[PDB]
Design a protein around this ligand. Structure first.
Ligand code: HEM
Ligand SMILES: CC(C)(C)c1ccc(C(=O)O)cc1
Ligand SMILES: [Cl-]
Length: 393
């Protein structure tokens, strides 16, 4: 009844161009079986949204990667938030929510905005820059580690550790094996910065440790909640801002619209998150036998959700393959959906908005003037290099 497919969603050819295979996955049926990894797959918006919003059936505590924590050891201690289910997930969630609160965004918005304007000004003095290393990487590296309260030394470990985490979600292919192989120094740095003495006052990390007396989390839970922000707080933002520049570079009509109205900067970033989906895929594990789209899925089965495919499903989106900065983007699953929907999305959207705002006000043109290089990762979509020439406004 369920179609079986040999498509490997974690192969280099798939990363290089996932969109044809994703239509094949969507049109084959609401639920597919991927013989390559012995998992169920859902690529349409409706089923992906349903799975995300049924955490009791499709749990996260047995792992959101291919590996079933009931069968294998996790490569690192489980995240108290990403790899946890209600009720154990609830209170660590509320703490990270209050740490990354609207009140916290108001305190850091000016500094994030000025750093974005200063970076775009610095890049316009060079002209021909690499939009990944000199922009998508440089700007979040200039605001987020300081906002965490991180020390200067060892920041070179932050992006490698994040790429390691995203790769460890994948199957045991060479990407995952090699990442875990080179992991030990990145782990040691990250875990050490999670301790309370190493987090400067006022920052996100010190605020997490300060939330350990309210009855929501204990002091021994604080280091791993800090680890969550050090795992997730940089890499997806880099790929997201890199996606927006990429989109604005390929669609000059939208850049001209964004210049004419800079208030579109926030939705311009949101549409880039839908269009490129920095987080392509995630797993769930069935806790019971369940019926999903006419398919009966037994207990203990891994279910792979194609978030990026769900954000391009024509059953849900009009002209899904077009970058439209005025699109009604509400409902896209680039940040997830339901109880696990990104708790740090206010930080990502703030960085993305103030960056596109700076580009909208200071840049006249963004032209690709060099070979574009893709970054391959088991979970994330993003570029390794984006050579652009920036024309000042
Ligand atoms: C463009 C930027 C980002 C994207 C596309 C993104 C994507 C996602 C997605 C899809 C999820 C859902 C995972 C799931 O359902 O299993 C998630 C959760 C999460 N994100 Fe983000 N994220 C971004 C930025 C951030 C930032 C800036 C932070 C922290 C400062 C962060 C921290 C987290 C955490 C802790 C979770 C787990 C929440 C939970 O399990 O309840 N993310 N993210
Ligand atoms: C941004 C993604 C979804 C990849 C993420 C979220 C949370 C964690 C964690 O460590 O809790 C790690 C990664
Ligand atoms: Cl680790």
């Amino acid at each position: 009844t369920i179609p079986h497919l040999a498509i490997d969603p974690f192969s280099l050819d798939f990363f290089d161009d996932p969109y044809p295979d994703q239509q094949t996955l969507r049109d084959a049926g609401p639920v597919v079986y991927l013989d390559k990894w012995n998992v169920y797959g859902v690529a349409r918006y409706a089923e992906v949204h349903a799975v995300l919003n049924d955490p009791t059936t499709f749990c996260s505590s047995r792992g959101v990667g291919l590996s079933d924590f009931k069968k294998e050891k996790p490569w690192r201690p489980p995240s108290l938030i990403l790899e946890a289910d209600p009720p154990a997930h609830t209170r660590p969630r509320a703490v990270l929510s209050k740490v990354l609160s609207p009140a916290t965004m108001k305190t850091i918005r000016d500094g994030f905005a000025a750093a974005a304007d200063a970076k775009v000004d610095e890049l316009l003095q060079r002209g021909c820059i690499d939009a990944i290393a000199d922009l998508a990487e440089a700007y979040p590296l200039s605001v987020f580690p300081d906002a965490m309260g991180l020390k200067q030394e060892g920041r070179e470990h932050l992006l490698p550790y994040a790429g390691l985490v995203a790769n460890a979600f994948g199957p045991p292919n060479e990407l995952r094996q090699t990442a875990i192989e080179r992991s030990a120094p990145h782990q040691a740095y990250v875990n050490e910065q999670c301790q309370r003495p190493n987090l400067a006052p006022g920052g996100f990390g010190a605020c997490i440790h300060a939330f350990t007396d309210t009855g929501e989390i204990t002091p021994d839970e604080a280091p791993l909640l800090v680890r969550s922000l050090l795992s997730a707080g940089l890499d997806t933002t880099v790929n997201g801002i890199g996606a927006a520049v990429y989109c604005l570079a390929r669609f000059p009509g939208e850049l001209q619209r964004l210049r004419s109205d800079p208030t579109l900067a926030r939705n311009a970033f949101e549409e880039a998150v839908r269009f490129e989906s920095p987080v392509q895929t995630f797993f769930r594990t069935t806790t019971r036998e369940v019926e999903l789209g006419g398919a009966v899925i037994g207990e203990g089965e891994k279910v792979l959700m194609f978030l990026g495919s769900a954000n391009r499903d024509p059953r849900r989106w009009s002209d899904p393959d077009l970058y439209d900065i005025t699109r009604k983007t509400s409902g896209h699953v680039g940040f997830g959906s339901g109880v696990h929907m990104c708790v740090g999305q206010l930080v990502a959207r703030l960085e993305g908005e103030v960056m596109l705002s700076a580009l909208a006000r200071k840049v006249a043109a963004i032209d690709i003037d060099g070979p574009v290089k893709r970054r391959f990762n088991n979970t994330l979509r993003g570029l390794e290099s984006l050579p652009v020439k920036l024309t000042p406004a």
